Symmetry: C2
Subunit: 282 residues, 2 copies
C-alpha cells in the first residue's frame, strides 16, 4: 500500500494549494484597497509637477525630457547622486558595503539596493550564493542551538519557582511559549527597532516594519539599516550584524511555531467540519 498514502498525500497538497490561492487573492485585494488610492493621488500630482516645467521651458526638446528621466532612473538603480553641489560622492562597493552585500546574499534577504552590474559580479554572485547559502545554513543552525540552550537553562529556573499546588506537565508549556514570545519580541524586535528609530531617523512603524521584513528574509530593500550617509558611530553596524545573526535564528523558530499553530487550527477546523456535518441542524 505505497500508493495508498501517495493518493492521500496529493489530496492534502491540493487543498493546501487551493488555500494558498485563496490567501493570495484575499491579500491581493487588501493591498490595492490600501495602495491603489495613494498611487493615483501621487500620479495626478506628479503630472501636476510635470506640466509646471513642461511649458515652463519650451526651448527643450520636451521629448528628451521624458527621455532624460529614463537616463536618471535607469542610472539610479546602481546608486547615483547626480548633483552639482555634491560632485564628490561616497562609494557603494567599498570595503564595508561589499561586505554588507555578501551578507545579503548568503542570508537570502537580498535588499537589492546594491546589486552586481558586471557580468562577472553576476557570475560570481551565482556561485557565491549556491555555496554561501548552505554554508550560512549551518551557522544559523548552531546559533539556533546555542540560543536555544541558553533558554533551556532559563526555563529550568522559571519552571521550578512557579511549581505550586495543582501543577501539570503539558499546561506549563503554555507559560513557556509565552515568555519566549515576550522576551524574544523585546530583544530582537522591540529593543532593536528603537535604536533604528533614533539612529536611522525612521518612524516607530517603519523600524518595526524593517525588522520584520528583514528577519523574515523577504528584504524588499525599501528600508535598510546603515543605508544613508549620516554618521554611523560604527559601534552601530557591527551590532547590526549580530542582531541579524541572532534575530534570524529567532524568527526561524517563531515562524516554525506559527506553522504548528496552523496545523492545529487546521486539525480543530477539519474536525469541527466533521461535527457540523455530523449534526447539521438536529
Amino acid at each position: 500500500s505505497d500508493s495508498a498514502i501517495n493518493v492521500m498525500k496529493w489530496k492534502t497538497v491540493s487543498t493546501i494549494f487551493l488555500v494558498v490561492v485563496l490567501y493570495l487573492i484575499i491579500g491581493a485585494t487588501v493591498f490595492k484597497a490600501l495602495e491603489q488610492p495613494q498611487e493615483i493621488s501621487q500620479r495626478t500630482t506628479i503630472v501636476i509637477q510635470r506640466e509646471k516645467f513642461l511649458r515652463a521651458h519650451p526651448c527643450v526638446s520636451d521629448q528628451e525630457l521624458d527621455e532624460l528621466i529614463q537616463q536618471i532612473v535607469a542610472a539610479i538603480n546602481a546608486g547615483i547622486i547626480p548633483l552639482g553641489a555634491s560632485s564628490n560622492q561616497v562609494s557603494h562597493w567599498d570595503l564595508g558595503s561589499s561586505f554588507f552585500f555578501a551578507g545579503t546574499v548568503i542570508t537570502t534577504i537580498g535588499f537589492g539596493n546594491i546589486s552586481p552590474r558586471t557580468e562577472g559580479g553576476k557570475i560570481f554572485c551565482i556561485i557565491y550564493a549556491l555555496l554561501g547559502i548552505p554554508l550560512f545554513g549551518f551557522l544559523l543552525a548552531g546559533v539556533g542551538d546555542q540560543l536555544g540552550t541558553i533558554f533551556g537553562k532559563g526555563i529550568a529556573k522559571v519552571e521550578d519557582t512557579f511549581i505550586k499546588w495543582n501543577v501539570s506537565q503539558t499546561k506549563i508549556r503554555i507559560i513557556s511559549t509565552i515568555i519566549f514570545i515576550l522576551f524574544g519580541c523585546v530583544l530582537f524586535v522591540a529593543l532593536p527597532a528603537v535604536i533604528f528609530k533614533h539612529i536611522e531617523g525612521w518612524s516607530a512603524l517603519d523600524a518595526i516594519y524593517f525588522v520584520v521584513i528583514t528577519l523574515t528574509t523577504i528584504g524588499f530593500g525599501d528600508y535598510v539599516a546603515g543605508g544613508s550617509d549620516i554618521e554611523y558611530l560604527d559601534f552601530y553596524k557591527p551590532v547590526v550584524w549580530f542582531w541579524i545573526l541572532v534575530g534570524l535564528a529567532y524568527f526561524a523558530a517563531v515562524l516554525s511555531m506559527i506553522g504548528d499553530w496552523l496545523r492545529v487550527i487546521a486539525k480543530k477546523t477539519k474536525e469541527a467540519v466533521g461535527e457540523f456535518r455530523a449534526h447539521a441542524a438536529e
Copy 2:
C-alpha cells in the same frame, strides 16, 4: 558532564562562524574587485551627461536642474503598480520571501497588513512548498527506479551508481528549472542569456534583489505567461530547496575530509619530527 557537551558545541559553532566571516571577507573583496570599477566609470559618465545636458540646452539653467532631480528622487519612492494582478504578485513576493521589492507598501496600513500577512503567509506557503517538493521528489523516484534497473545488471556495480544518479537529478534539474525557463525569459523579456540565468538563481533561492523581475517591464505578455511563471516558481523553489540542501550535505562531507586531512598533516609532522 553537561557543560562539557556544551563546550564541544560552542567550539563547533565558533569555527563555522569563523568560516562564515572568512567567507564574507573573501566575497567582499571579490565583489569590491568586480563592481568598484563600473561604479567609477558610470560615475564619470553620469557627470559628463549632467553638464552635457546644460550645454546642449542652454534652455535649462543650472539652478533648475537640481529641483528637477529632487522630484525624480521622490518618483522613485512611488514608482499602475497596485492593480488586480500586481498586488497578487506582491502577495507572492511576500509569502515566498523572495520579496523583489520593485513593489512595496507605502501606506502605514499596508505596512501593518504586510507584517500580519507575512507572519501568517510564510508558514502557510511552507506547507504548500513542502507537499510540492514531496510530490516532485516521488515523481523523480519513479524515474530513478527505472534508471537504477537498466544500468544495474551489468557494468560496475553499486557504491558509485549513487553518484551517477545525483548527476541525473542535477543534469535534468538544471534543464527543466534553470535552462528551459531562462530560454523563455530571454525571448519574452529581452534579457541576455546571463541576465536570465542570473534572474533564475536570484529568484529561486529567495534572494530576489529585484533588479530583474519577470513581468515587471512594460510589455505585452501572452495571457499564459505570468501563470506559468507562478507554477515555475512553485516547482522551482522546491528544486533549489533540495539542491541547496545537497550542497549543504556536500559541505558536510568535505568539511570532514579537510578536518582529518589536517590531522594527517599535523600527524606526519608528528612522527617525521620524532625522527631525530
